[PDB]
Design a protein around this ligand. Sequence first.
Ligand SMILES: Nc1ncnc2c1ncn2[C@@H]1O[C@H](COP(=O)(O)OP(=O)(O)OP(=O)(O)O)[C@@H](O)[C@H]1O
Ligand SMILES: [Ca+2]
Ligand SMILES: [Ca+2]
Ligand SMILES: [Ca+2]
Lengths: 11, 360, 125
Amino acid sequence: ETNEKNPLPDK
Amino acid sequence: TALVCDNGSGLVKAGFAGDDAPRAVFPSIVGRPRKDSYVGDEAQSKRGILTLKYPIEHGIITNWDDMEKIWHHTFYNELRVAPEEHPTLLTEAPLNPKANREKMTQIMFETFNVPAMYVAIQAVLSLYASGRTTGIVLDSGDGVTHNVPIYEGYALPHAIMRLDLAGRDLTDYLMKILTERGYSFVTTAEREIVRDIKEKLCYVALDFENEMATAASSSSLEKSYELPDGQVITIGNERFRCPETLFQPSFIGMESAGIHETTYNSIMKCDIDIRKDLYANNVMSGGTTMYPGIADRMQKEITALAPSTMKIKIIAPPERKYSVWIGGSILASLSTFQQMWITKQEYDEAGPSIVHRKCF
Amino acid sequence: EHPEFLKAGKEPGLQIWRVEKFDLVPVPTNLYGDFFTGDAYVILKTVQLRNGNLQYDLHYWLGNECSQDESGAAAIFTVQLDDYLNGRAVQHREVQGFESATFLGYFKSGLKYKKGGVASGFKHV
Ligand SMILES: Nc1ncnc2c1ncn2[C@@H]1O[C@H](COP(=O)(O)OP(=O)(O)OP(=O)(O)O)[C@@H](O)[C@H]1O
Ligand SMILES: [Ca+2]
Ligand SMILES: [Ca+2]
Ligand SMILES: [Ca+2]
């Protein structure tokens, strides 16, 4: 199970 | 068990040899407030207080103190290993400066105390992952695009083409033309939103001029994207205009030939006797080759450039964002690889220049 | 150093190995020509040249259902075998249903296929 740790910024 | 670390301009792909995929994929960024620093996903979320720096530019490591922080983060935070226990396969760009290879080797042995290490060329690993020893790789990531012709397992250095047009340039261009459409994408936080639009909505047109006329006489090529705040925005011809830049670099003021032309130029720098095998084995790798339609477009464009009797084949594996890593995972796992590592003992006796004799 | 490399290309003849979980494993001589389509194989044909030297052709055969680790390994083993033989081997990629006339000619009774093979060496993550 790959965890791509790259989340988008919120408001 | 051996570790595999594929360091890119935009993303680190890290994992264990013998796995079918990297365990960890995270941004190759170091953030500082101006806790001293933050690396990867932590640096991304805390960007309100942090200034971000990329230790790798156009595939080449240029900030070695920040690169050590990336590697520390990989070993301890992501893979959660003791480096001294694990042979470590690293990857490098084609034509990576000799002094860089040595520095990489020095850091692994002297800072991280690895028992063994190896450095492989990214494009070659990708070819291996496709089950080939001969072919031409189009590797396009976040920071750089290369054409790498390979014969019987080894790259042909004289024929390698570098193009400083890749994913980040495409993201910046999409920001520009979406701004022209009425929106306001300019800040670094907003860059990542546009990168997501690019990844979800963009595609390569089989015939560009025909697509422009379709988008002008229809709206069936238009899509909607929900911004973080909730604002739904529309994307029209920008969808295919963005990646078209790969084929027409004049779209961003570049004088360079597009990826189809560099592919042909690269093949033409090789011996006429191997070109047939090059044309029949065009392998795409890296995130920027992920656009729907790109393989079909490349097939069309190279057919138009090659002799009419040439068998042309574009290979575009679904897993090609991770092809480099997967090739490394396979390589490190082979029973025949045990003798190929540079050991700590070999490093103690020979110093960093051993990398030029043990690793092509 | 690998025991099968030491055996490779010593005399004229045909040598076949199967990729089995990241290793090169010799195929029993009685089973030559019966290929598992779920698998990948490395084939070395050694020919006696009149000049005293040996001629080498390395073929890596890829089954329609072989896993990525196996086709990847077969390709790499081929490169390594070639290097071990001083670069003198000519490498050939052979895909099921599309094999070269010369490859097919190695099997006097005719090459045949069967479904199945050894499991992938990959851990799924
Ligand atoms: N589906 C997609 N469509 C278009 N682009 C994508 C897609 N998925 C990822 N990308 C882009 O691919 C890039 C990341 O790919 P990759 O991990 O191969 O690059 P890298 O190794 O970090 O950079 P480089 O190889 O240039 O040093 C990013 O620019 C990202 O936006
Ligand atoms: Ca890369
Ligand atoms: Ca199998
Ligand atoms: Ca050879």
